[PDB]
Paper text:
The density maps at atomic resolution, in particular the density at the virus–receptor interface, revealed that PKD2 binds to AAV1 and PKD1 binds to AAV5. In contrast, PKD1 contacts the outer rim of the spike on the AAV5 capsid outwards the icosahedral threefold axis, which is on the opposite side of AAVR PKD2 bound to AAV1/AAV2, and spans the canyon region towards the icosahedral fivefold axis and the twofold/fivefold wall of the capsid. The AAVR PKD1 polypeptide spanning residues from AAVRV305 to AAVRE401 was built into the density and refined. PKD1 adopts an Ig-like fold and consists of two stacked antiparallel β-sheets containing nine stands. Each PKD1 molecule mainly contacts one AAV5 capsomer (named capsomer A) but makes one additional contact with an adjacent AAV5 capsomer (named capsomer B). The PKD1 residues in strands F/G and the CD loop interact with the AAV5 capsomers to form a major fulcrum. However, the structures of AAV5 capsomers with and without PKD1 attached display strict structural homology with an r.m.s.d of 0.27 Å for all Cɑ atoms from 519 residues, indicating that no obvious structural shift occurs upon AAVR binding. As a control, the wild-type (wt) AAVR bound to AAV5 with a KD value of 0.287 μM.
Adeno-associated viruses (AAVs) belong to the Dependoparvovirus genus within the Parvoviridae family. Because of the broad differences in their tissue tropism and transduction efficiency and the absence of pathology, AAVs are the promising vehicles for therapeutic gene delivery. Adeno-associated virus receptor (AAVR), which is a glycosylated protein containing five polycystic kidney disease (PKD) repeat domains in its extracellular portion, was recently identified as a key proteinaceous receptor for multiple AAV serotypes to employ the post-attachment events of viral entry. To dissect the divergent rules of engagements between multiple AAV serotypes with AAVR, we select two AAV serotypes, AAV1 and AAV5, and solve the atomic structures of their complexes with AAVR by cryo-EM.
Numbering used by the authors:
A (entry chain A), B (entry chain A), C (entry chain A): 209 to 724
Write the structure that this text describes.
Amino acid sequence: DGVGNASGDWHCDSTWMGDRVVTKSTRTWVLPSYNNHQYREIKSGSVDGSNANAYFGYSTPWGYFDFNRFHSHWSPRDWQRLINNYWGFRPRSLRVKIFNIQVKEVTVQDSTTTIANNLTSTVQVFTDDDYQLPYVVGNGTEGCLPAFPPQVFTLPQYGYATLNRDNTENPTERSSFFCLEYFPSKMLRTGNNFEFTYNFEEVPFHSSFAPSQNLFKLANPLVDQYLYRFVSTNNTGGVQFNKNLAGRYANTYKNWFPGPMGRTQGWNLGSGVNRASVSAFATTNRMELEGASYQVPPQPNGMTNNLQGSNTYALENTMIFNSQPANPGTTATYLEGNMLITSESETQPVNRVAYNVGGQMATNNQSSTTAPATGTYNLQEIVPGSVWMERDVYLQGPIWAKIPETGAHFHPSPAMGGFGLKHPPPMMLIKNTPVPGNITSFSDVPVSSFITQYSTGQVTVEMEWELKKENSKRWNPEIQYTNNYNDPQFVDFAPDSTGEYRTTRPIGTRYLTRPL
Amino acid sequence: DGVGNASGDWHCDSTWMGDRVVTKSTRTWVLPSYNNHQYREIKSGSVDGSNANAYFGYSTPWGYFDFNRFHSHWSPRDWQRLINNYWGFRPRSLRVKIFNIQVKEVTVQDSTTTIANNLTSTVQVFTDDDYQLPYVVGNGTEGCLPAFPPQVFTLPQYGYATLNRDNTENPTERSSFFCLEYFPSKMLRTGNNFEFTYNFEEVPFHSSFAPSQNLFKLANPLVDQYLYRFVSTNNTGGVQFNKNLAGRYANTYKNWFPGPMGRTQGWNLGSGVNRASVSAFATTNRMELEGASYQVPPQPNGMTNNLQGSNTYALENTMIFNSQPANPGTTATYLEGNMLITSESETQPVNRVAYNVGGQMATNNQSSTTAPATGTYNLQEIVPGSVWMERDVYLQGPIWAKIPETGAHFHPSPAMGGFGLKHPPPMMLIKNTPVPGNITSFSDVPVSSFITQYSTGQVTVEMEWELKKENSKRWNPEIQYTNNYNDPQFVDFAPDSTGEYRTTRPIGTRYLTRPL
Amino acid sequence: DGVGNASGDWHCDSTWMGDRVVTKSTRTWVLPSYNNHQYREIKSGSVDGSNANAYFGYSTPWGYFDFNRFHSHWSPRDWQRLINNYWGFRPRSLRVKIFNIQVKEVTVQDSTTTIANNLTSTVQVFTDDDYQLPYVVGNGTEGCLPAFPPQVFTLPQYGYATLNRDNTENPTERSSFFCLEYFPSKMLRTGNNFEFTYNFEEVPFHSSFAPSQNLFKLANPLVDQYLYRFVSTNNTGGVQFNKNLAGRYANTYKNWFPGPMGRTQGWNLGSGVNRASVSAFATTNRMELEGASYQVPPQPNGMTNNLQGSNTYALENTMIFNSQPANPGTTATYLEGNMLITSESETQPVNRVAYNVGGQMATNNQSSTTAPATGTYNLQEIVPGSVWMERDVYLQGPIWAKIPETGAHFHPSPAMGGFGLKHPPPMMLIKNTPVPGNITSFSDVPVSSFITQYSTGQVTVEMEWELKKENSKRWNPEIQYTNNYNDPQFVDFAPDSTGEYRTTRPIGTRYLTRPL
């Protein structure tokens, strides 16, 4: 209620309750006064020789809350207890609560930066629950809540890129500008707090199970099919047929088919017999959209890199995390030992691999003169009767994404993994209100001299997850995420002597196994 | 009730009522006695050198009502008030009402064509609401209600093409014949009327908004992704990775993908550097269906001609209306100045252009010997995680179409734009009953001499439209359909000194703008 | 209630509710301690060679709130949605609310200006709702709420000019002095707020429609009048008459007449064939009032500059805004490219142009000796049966004005446009209470050493607007305010890379069209 009273407590826990788990998480944040309290016009042309990077947009002084990663809510033990016990999970509700606001004021006088707090300065928070702003949350950007609870994170500055003109930095007449002070926002002093509740829409469970059985090997290898296959022609043009035998899965009749494919390049990790000195930009899979051509990693769902125990990965198809957060705007050439190169090997009985051709189809009509000929294709889209698996979600990866408000779409599983939401959690924007400096006269030009200041405080996020319980009559034990290190020099998913949070490997969800 | 009393009034109006608009429209029609009151066998072989044009079918004396265009219900001002204020619209109900029937009888005696009315002759009207007839309404044919209310239109003759045999004019044993006098029809004198009500099924709203934001540019250009991309290999085969920077949309990880594509040829309008003297038939995109090969304009949804401000259009992908209705069976070579060549430039942030390749995929497996190679594809079908925009509807274009009664289908947006209906508005068939001439003796052969006669009357159509209200926090003004002509020599969407209804340009729906 | 609690939230929105729109707007203000807390005697003589500029008056330490411009309440999109959809609008209620007061105290010690806040200092606010003060709000002065919500504005100092004597700086015995601490004012600490409600009186709607039809062309051009005109005399003095034909509007009988006129000088913008090197002061239209002569722009209602598509404007008749707010007291010679020269071309079917003579009247009595002669007049006042159009209101222009408390008036449309109010919104005056410095002894002279200090805070203004709905049976589309720029280098009505709010063109209201 006032300055000498706590406006909320530290809730950071998890409570497994049957087929349901709430996951609370309080973090501490810092909000810089971005742009010195003004809207700016960020724009760029073709950098790196590509006019795909040309954008037009606006950068606001508003910061925002991005709790759209799984480690922001899940400890690695509560993640381990999830992915080794349950076949699925999906979010149900959400409860965000910003509290203990305190706003300092830096006063650099003769290089003595005194930092004191003003009790009177406010903080604006609104939530965009009519979805009228550019939703920039679900795009794999930084500025998230940290994985580790005693880390203090700075809130990312809110910008958005509108329509540019002809792949330049210049706008078009459809390019918009959203003023964010034209939205009603709650003014928060140091004794006020901002609560917010949200209920997720009906989404499918994330299929956190690996297949126990190949897709083209769903018949039993004991009894044989009552269907025959064309095998050959005789010395005349008379066709000949053979019975599909029992375990001959290469030529049985299939009833279901794998998912989409676009053949990406496969690069060897580990030892590697890769091509030396490849500038890997000019040969990636691009998807040209209204002018320029864009790299689109990862490719849409229905494929996999990395078959099984092979060091060949499709690096265009994968999600490559770093081990630690990096400095912004770095041009460092990281190697294999720095990254978390993340495999989708668990879905190979259903999905086709991305560094191999998917099949072959007949190219000509045969005759007594022309022999039959086939040709391999590098990409195949949705066929009726297809079945694929969605992208695996990770502890270090995004939870949701917003479906773009277009006319139509085909089934909206995000390519980066997670939950495709039509009405996602609304984007909580926040800024410091501008406090003017010493203004002694009237002028019609607006104030450009402000008290330089930042605010800080805590935020708690309480999600709730409906879980799909495992129910299998499998006899032998399964593979599960065990803590298996040979001679650990450090405890993983735990700090070090420096005090930085050390993660080494990404953690999937498909560890339970389930027959098709 | 009788001959001296009006059997219905002229309702032609529109009543905007919140998120709902009823649009009434009365027109005056003329019904010729088609075929001289008999069923005939229309059939043809390969004309224009193509056996696709070979059909077998039947032509009835029945005429029909085709109010399946948007200008039959919408004035251009009420269309302007729709497409500049609302994000969507869909039909809800329908009410057709045929009234003031009067049937003349032409009597050419010594070249003095006296036209008098017989009070006793009837008119048959039935509606086909069990969908047992070939539904020929939603196919882009003429004979519609006019755009302009005081125009009198003639009702189109009802024919249908059944199954022919082996791309000839001869029938197969599956070819059917539907007698239309085997359906119960209401006999209408000059004092009778025919009412009919219809409620549309649950359809999606037509997305009458343009995107404010590119599909591959949905991240913000301020914070950068926590995902890395394979960039290159070193002097060994060791892979190397770089962080996806903030605004580098050409190589970020994408979550949603564009729609289908088939690469069509792009032709330059305006000035034009087109290839001179092209017979443009042999190089169009065809789709061979059970024998012959058919041109299929427009190609299915998910593409666009005409990027932005460029004079290159994909003429195979577009809807080309004329400015005025034309005489039937004309072989005139119209030019650019006659037609209404209709752009889909508003959907280019989501759809791929039809005169460019959509992307490229890896063609080989790399090694220390073989370098990586990619290959461009000209067509890509549905991939899971796709999102496209539907075809824009126009003031001069069709409202609905019937889904064919087959087994299965994929999401039934008609390629010509509009609303894919499973149970469309039933086809109102109408004919003049045959009045025999002077028959003085009995003969078992049926009567072939009739009183030559036509009927005329009014028809009113009352549709009802549920509207999706615009709700955006966009700050700057939008583009809207304004009446912008530089030195008009005539008022557009209004008559001239001749009295003919002059339209110059087609009117879309996507003028409001909305972020993905 | 206290220092650690927010005393009000940021309301800044608009809610269109049928034929009604509320427009909330919160801004942040800075209040300097004007005059160092004392009343002063501002007076001047003849500057610029004109004794019209000689005034006597008083300058107070009070600042005031001036939300009397349309952009203080309306975003340009909500202004666009108004002027393209409605035929009229007028204010109904008002709700001002000053909150989050915080008062700093600047302490310059050895050129180290430390700015800290005192929790104990107060702020006086009263509202003048008996109209006992000189109302200086509705006069086109600066110090308004900004157009753009995150701009912080400084409150203008309240002064007023009373009666001087004989066009000098000396007062007369009727010259008054209003002490503003003789009015009861609410003392506001940092935990207090000041609410205020107001209901506007019955005013006419602002006619935000252009005429679709000329005033002298209201007959139809098909049938002719039953009234004859004197055309000529014969070889004798016998009069002769002709019938007024159908479309001959130059000599039909008129029933209604245009508004007032005073011929101003017309100057060419754009290319321009203007007279070179004109000191444009000595030839303007003046209106001499009790001694001196005053320029009176704009001239009273009933005229227009700028016919249609011509570059000749009457610059004495127009409202010339700047693109950006300017520094106070500037003597800069702005050009055409800086200003927002604002046209009244939309009202030319009803109003007469200001750079042309309005008509001619007979100067002599004719005879057999003297021929008839006419003479053009340069000004014509109200004639019974007149009809004119009021001044267009703009997004950048004033909302209301106070009618002077005189005896009588003729219909009080303000010449600067807007709503003539008899009891306007009361003028919210505000000052910082004086906190004395170090006073160690008693003296009967009042304290002149104070703690130098300023206060800041937020103010929200909630107006409510009754709207006149458009209802026209016009067929063709209208002209509307579209966002039409050819190659934009910047988004208009939105910031730039500097962060300043960029407006280029003024926005009217007459875009709908309506017949007389």
